[PDB]
A paper describes a structure:
Here, we show that dipeptidyl peptidase 11 (DPP11), a central metabolic enzyme in these bacteria, undergoes a conformational change upon peptide binding to distinguish substrates from end products. As previously reported, the overall fold of DPP11 comprises a bilobal architecture. The upper helical domain dictates the specificity of the enzyme and caps the catalytic domain, which has a typical chymotrypsin double β-barrel fold. The active site of DPP11 lays in a wide cleft running through the middle of the protein between the catalytic and helical domains, which contributes to the formation of the substrate binding subsites.
We determined the structures for the inactive constructs PgDPP1122-720 S655A, PeDPP1122-717 S652A and its complexes with the dipeptides Arg-Asp and Arg-Glu, as well as the substrate Leu-Asp-Val-Trp, at 2.4, 2.85, 2.2, 2.1 and 2.6 Å resolution, referred to as PgDPP11, PeDPP11, PeDPP11:RD, PeDPP11:RE and PeDPP11:LDVWs, respectively. In PeDPP11:LDVW, the third and fourth amino acids of the substrate (Val and Trp at positions P1′ and P2′, respectively) exhibit few interactions with the enzyme. For instance, Val (P1′) displays a weakly defined electron density with only 40% of its solvent accessible area buried by DPP11, while Trp (P2′) completely lacks electron density. This active site design renders the enzyme’s specificity more relaxed, with selectivity imposed mainly at P1 and P2 residues of the substrate. However, our crystal structures of DPP11 in complex with LDVW and dipeptide RD are both in closed conformation, excluding the possibility that solvent released from the protein’s cleft would explain the larger increase in entropy upon substrate binding. When compared to unbound PeDPP11, the r.m.s.d. of the helical domain is 5-fold higher than that of the catalytic domain for PeDPP11:LDVW and 2-fold higher for PeDPP11:RD and PeDPP11:RE. Particularly, the unfolding of helix α14 (residues 320–346) and loop F441-K451 upon LDVW binding corroborates our hypothesis that protein conformational change is the determining factor for the opposed thermodynamics signatures observed upon peptide binding. Consistent with the measured endothermic binding, we propose that energy is absorbed from the solution to break key interactions, such as those stabilizing loop F441-K451 and intra-main chain polar interactions that stabilize helix α14, but possibly in additional regions of the helical domain. Upon DPP11-substrate binding, the increase in protein conformational entropy counterbalances the overall entropic costs in protein-peptide interactions (including loss of protein and peptide degrees of freedom).
Author numbering: 22 to 315, 319 to 441, 451 to 717
Write the structure that this text describes.
Amino acid sequence: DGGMWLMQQINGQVARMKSLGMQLEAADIYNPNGSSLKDAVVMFDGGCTGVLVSNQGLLLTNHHCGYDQIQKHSSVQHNYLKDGFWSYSLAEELVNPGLEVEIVDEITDVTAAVKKELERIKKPSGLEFLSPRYLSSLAPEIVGKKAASRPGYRYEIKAFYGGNRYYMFTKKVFRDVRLVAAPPSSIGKFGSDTDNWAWPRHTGDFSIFRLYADKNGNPAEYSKDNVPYRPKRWVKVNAQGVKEGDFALIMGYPGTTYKFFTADEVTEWSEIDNNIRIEMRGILQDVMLREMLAINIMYAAKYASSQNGYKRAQGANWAIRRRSLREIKLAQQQEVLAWAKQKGIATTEEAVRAISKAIEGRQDLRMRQRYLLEGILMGIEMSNAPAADSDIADHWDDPARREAGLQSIRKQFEAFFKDQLAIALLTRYAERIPAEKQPISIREGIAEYGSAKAYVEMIFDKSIYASRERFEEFMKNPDRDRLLRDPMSRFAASVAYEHQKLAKEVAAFDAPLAAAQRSYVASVLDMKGQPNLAPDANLTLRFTYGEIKGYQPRDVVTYGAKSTLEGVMEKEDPNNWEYVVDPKLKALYEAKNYGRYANSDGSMPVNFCATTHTTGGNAGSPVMNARGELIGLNFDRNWEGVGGDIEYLPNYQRSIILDIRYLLFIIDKFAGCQRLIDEIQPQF
């Protein structure tokens, strides 16, 4: 199994899908000529998925997708992160500036078109035929006035199959997306650390938004007279529950896969990107833990993000050792190599040779890129330190410029908001990177101060952005020269410099590599048929299907397909931030007050898992039953499924899904927001 299918690949798959129990027509799911399910599956925050579930544009996504919004409306008397949030009228729904949600108007093959505007490039770079920025900046010339016209629409074009296809997505872009509801963190990220990437799972990973339109029902900035968008198609919520072996369909926006990796590629990604992440985030997850001195670990967002990718890395390294992945890809790469030879072709073979060549050439440079990335760019927040704009430098003596320049600073600082973390990371960074290959500021700082430690310490001492209260003191009496010579802004600047410098040099290998990549995939595409080959993920809309089914992780151990509230009670621990259970939830358990939302055996459902092929970016994806109705929301994969980006394994890999009845239960029985039960209209 496997495959994240193009929406227009549905005809080639509808067959097998009905086989496993689907009772939908291909055109129910994707319809070029009009209304279909594709119209209900939206992209959230350019990172997650979401689904429209009412005619008033109600939008279901994951708690961890909407975590930042909630944190942004949260405060000491708000604190929606802790208590959750429940709006009872359209007016109560919160506004969140800078949050976008893209629907897909339609999908157009633009392969021929793109390839021509690709030729006739004066001395091309070698990288543009993949770059979405460049590829989307071709859209007007393809569709004319209507592009760069409708303010609501946006035109996205990406490379598929290594660059052997290009498809275009006409995106309606909504810019007033409002926060309806959220559960408390105790439910939304229950087991946040331990249970992450794990099945069994007991997490209510949901949150609710709504799309707002204008009087005529179009994408819109925020306006006090915006109104609930009336969707073409929204998905119906079915609450008659699920049983093992049921058909399950997922539609959403998978971000990245490497299913066409050659053997040498697997090994590099493992030994370079993956391991450097393991090394570096391990240090971070150390120093940031052992500051164990009481506050709640639950709301440490930076830590949580890092740890989430740390664990995925760990589980990827694992699957490469234990699932024998390099050897699996090697077997694939040599099928096509065989097929080529037998058809007397040499294009295939010289690609693999090239791919391996590019790899060994860029070893030092990619390694450098990655230590910089993991160790400093992501790890150390000094890298996002404010920089003085032109006003401050040039026009300090024009009170208007100066105040705007200063207000550029306060703006930057706010987005920038600790000592020993930077030390630990820079210390190890400096050990791995020869001083001459370090960023100017760093190797010079270590020169003066004789240690990465002392250099770091200097910064936190001499800098204005070291703490909020230090900063505000400075702004009481701002000084020009002080702003221009801050050691942390220097750091941030030198680190970014090396970042772009590395990327320039390494282009010498990446470009041969992408070319060779394209050749190789062509061969595969030649061997198999495009209708039967699902491309890598690229944050565009895909579907995947399977069944609700558990697995056997071990000898003697069997995991089932479905999870219940008793699992929550079993894990309870008042002394573990992670497993604190909400009293109102507990009371409900010991009252067994599950209304019509309970399983057949009278247990209260929480999650379930299925054989669908999802990945990062799929968070929030709708999960639908055989008839197209919504039975759940995707939010994770299991530990054994992490190596599915490289190769899908049908008997370990599972998508971890929130039971839609758990969501309902929480709104209804826990929160009391009947209004939203009423808008959603669960079907029984």
